[PDB]
Amino acid sequence: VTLFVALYDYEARTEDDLSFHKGEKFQILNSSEGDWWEARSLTTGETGYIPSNYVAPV
């Protein structure tokens, strides 16, 4: 039980980060390896890394 929503949209400038918009759900699997955490979109099914300051516990 640790889902987080994006409070703001974001456009990954690379192919590693992910891209979404305010209101996108995300499942964080690891966030203790840098200010960026690895989240997986439960709508697209793709996983990547996004700004931890852009997500919060829904």
Partner: peptide, 14 residues
């Protein structure tokens, strides 16, 4: 290291 941590809109960064 410097991360891509984008600036949060709304309150932005002053």
């Amino acid at each position: 290291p410097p991360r891509p941590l984008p600036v949060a809109p709304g309150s932005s960064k002053t």
